[PDB]
């Protein structure tokens, strides 16, 4: 009986764990891509600040 | 001694009836139980492997 119950719970555990692993992989992919996008946006924002202070200096 | 012969023929008939009609079904039931438990063990092994 214990072996049968094991087999059942083990199959259930594997079935949910494959999906959990896929979900975790997708989550980390999304997090890394979000970090990359944030890096790009921050670089663009810093460049915009640079050109804005350049405009201020040139105007003065 | 005649009654001994009578019972011996009767027991031969009983054994024939058994081996003809009762042994096959009970043997099949035993085989089915054995195969069920064997399949359960194989499934457990496959579950561990999975």
Write the layout of secondary structure elements.
This is part of a larger assembly, with chains A (60 residues) and B (50 residues).
Chain A: H1 2-59
Chain B: H1 2-49
Report what the structure shows.
This is part of a larger assembly, with chains A (60 residues) and B (50 residues). Chain A has one helix spanning 2-59. Chain A is an all-alpha fold and 60 residues long. The relative contact order of chain B is 0.07. Chain B starts with a helix and ends with a helix. Chain B has one helix at residues 2-49. Chain B is 96% helix and 0% strand. Chain A binds chain B through residues 3-4, 6-7, 10-11, 14, and chain B through 40-41, 43-44, 47-48, 50. Chain B: It is found in: Cell membrane.
What would the keywords be for this entry?
part of a larger assembly, 2 chains, A: mainly alpha, 97% helix, B: mainly alpha, 96% helix, hydrolase, complex, synthase
Molecular shape of chain B: rod-shaped
**Oligomeric status of the shown chains?**
part of a larger assembly
The radius of gyration of chain B is 21 Å
C-alpha end-to-end distance of chain B: 69 Å
Q: How helix-rich are the residues of chain B, as a percent range? A: over 70%
Portion in beta strands of chain A: under 5%
- Please tell me how large the radius of gyration of chain A is: 26 Å
Structural class of chain A: mainly alpha
Biggest interface goes to: A-B, 7 and 7 residues
Subcellular location (chain A): Cell membrane
Protein name (chain A): ATP synthase subunit b
Family (chain A): Belongs to the ATPase B chain family.
Organism (chain A): Mycolicibacterium smegmatis (strain ATCC 700084 / mc(2)155) (Mycobacterium smegmatis)
